[PDB]
Design a protein around this motif. Sequence first.
Motif, PDB file in Angstrom:
ATOM      1  N   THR A   5      -9.122  73.483  89.939  1.00 29.53           N
ATOM      2  CA  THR A   5      -8.487  72.507  89.071  1.00 29.53           C
ATOM      3  C   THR A   5      -9.387  72.407  87.844  1.00 29.53           C
ATOM      4  N   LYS A   6      -8.812  72.619  86.657  1.00 29.40           N
ATOM      5  CA  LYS A   6      -9.616  72.666  85.419  1.00 29.40           C
ATOM      6  C   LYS A   6     -10.471  71.422  85.165  1.00 29.40           C
ATOM      7  N   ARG A   7      -9.904  70.245  85.388  1.00 33.68           N
ATOM      8  CA  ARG A   7     -10.591  68.969  85.184  1.00 33.68           C
ATOM      9  C   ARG A   7     -11.939  68.881  85.935  1.00 33.68           C
ATOM     10  N   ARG A  59     -13.800  72.682  78.315  1.00 32.97           N
ATOM     11  CA  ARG A  59     -15.012  73.320  77.796  1.00 32.97           C
ATOM     12  C   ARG A  59     -15.528  72.568  76.548  1.00 32.97           C
ATOM     13  N   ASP A 101      -3.135  67.527  82.664  1.00 28.80           N
ATOM     14  CA  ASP A 101      -3.094  68.992  82.815  1.00 28.80           C
ATOM     15  C   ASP A 101      -3.946  69.706  81.731  1.00 28.80           C
ATOM     16  N   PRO A 102      -5.252  69.371  81.640  1.00 26.82           N
ATOM     17  CA  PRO A 102      -6.075  69.973  80.571  1.00 26.82           C
ATOM     18  C   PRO A 102      -6.281  71.468  80.736  1.00 26.82           C
ATOM     19  N   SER A 103      -6.395  72.186  79.614  1.00 27.23           N
ATOM     20  CA  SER A 103      -6.649  73.620  79.639  1.00 27.23           C
ATOM     21  C   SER A 103      -8.155  73.820  79.801  1.00 27.23           C
ATOM     22  N   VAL A 104      -8.590  75.068  80.080  1.00 25.26           N
ATOM     23  CA  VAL A 104     -10.018  75.395  80.169  1.00 25.26           C
ATOM     24  C   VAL A 104     -10.691  75.081  78.816  1.00 25.26           C
ATOM     25  N   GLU A 105     -10.029  75.453  77.709  1.00 23.96           N
ATOM     26  CA  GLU A 105     -10.573  75.255  76.361  1.00 23.96           C
ATOM     27  C   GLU A 105     -10.770  73.746  76.084  1.00 23.96           C
ATOM     28  N   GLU A 106      -9.780  72.888  76.442  1.00 24.07           N
ATOM     29  CA  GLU A 106      -9.928  71.435  76.267  1.00 24.07           C
ATOM     30  C   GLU A 106     -11.135  70.892  77.059  1.00 24.07           C
ATOM     31  N   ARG A 124     -12.669  81.314  87.148  1.00 25.60           N
ATOM     32  CA  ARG A 124     -12.019  80.043  86.865  1.00 25.60           C
ATOM     33  C   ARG A 124     -10.832  79.707  87.778  1.00 25.60           C
TER      34      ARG A 124
END
Length: 306
Positions: free
Chosen positions: A179-181, A246, A239-244, A176
């Motif tokens: 950038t999470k998005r 996913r 700034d989303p997290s991986v969990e958001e 991972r």
Amino acid sequence: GHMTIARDIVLQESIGKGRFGEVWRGKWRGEEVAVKIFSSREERSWFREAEIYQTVMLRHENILGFIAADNKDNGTWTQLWLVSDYHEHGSLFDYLNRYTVTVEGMIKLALSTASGLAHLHMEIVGTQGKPAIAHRDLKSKNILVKKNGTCCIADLGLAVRHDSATDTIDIAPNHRVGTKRYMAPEVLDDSINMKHFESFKRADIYAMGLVFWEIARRCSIGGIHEDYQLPYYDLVPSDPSVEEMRKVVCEQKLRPNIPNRWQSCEALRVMAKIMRECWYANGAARLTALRIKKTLSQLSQQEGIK
Ligand SMILES: N#Cc1cnc2ccc(-c3c(-c4ccc(F)c(Cl)c4)ncn3CCO)nn12
């Protein structure tokens, strides 16, 4: 002295902050260049970027033109420099926030992005070969726009290179990164098989689909266009997290919305179809950068783009 070197470069203006290190506009032998500066403790990041940008046969009209890696001692500390071509428009993100584009403009941006990614992904076996390279952090803030309205892929620092002969990736890839998005579904849920290099190329294609959606929104026809937005602006916080991510992308299976007005225009129908074929959850079903380049080349030819 004919090659570009740090001692002969004068910094003129602060123009951005990179993943690590600061970006400046500078002047080298009367010409404008971009300079990214790292501290001594960031040698690993600076070195890895220098190494990727020095890859044999990397240069291409749609990949940021690298000039040199160097050091500059100001008498108190040593700065680690990367020097590249300078593009006044800055990132595709800046460009799309500032402007709307014509149908022709949109195709130019998409085709050039696909052409740069196709070159990055391309393996050339043999003598002066070229390893296949996967970006791992493709997004609109990581693509620059040239004066001629075409793109060049930048921010190669997190890239991975493949050696065909041994079927190995040059680094031990961390999970991972990126950038999470823009992370692909398989990266978000960690189902990605990081031992198969094709997994990385497929994840880049999903991100490219998101970038194409960003471009298409800004395409103005009869004064009709959408406002600038990042993919998933409607589903995740800044700034989303991986969990958001996913939960939206993997569990709820959502993708950026493709508006009805994109069916009225041929160029937009082609773009929308490409997006859908980049967004499949199954990476193996996605289009390749080369196939997208071919599709968009046929379209630019039909539109008569200069
Ligand atoms: N704003 C702006 C602007 C205008 N022209 C350029 C060219 C590059 C960059 C750049 C670099 C960078 C700079 C020098 C380098 F040698 C290398 Cl290998 C990379 N790293 C991040 N960025 C931000 C854009 O993604 N920014 N930029």
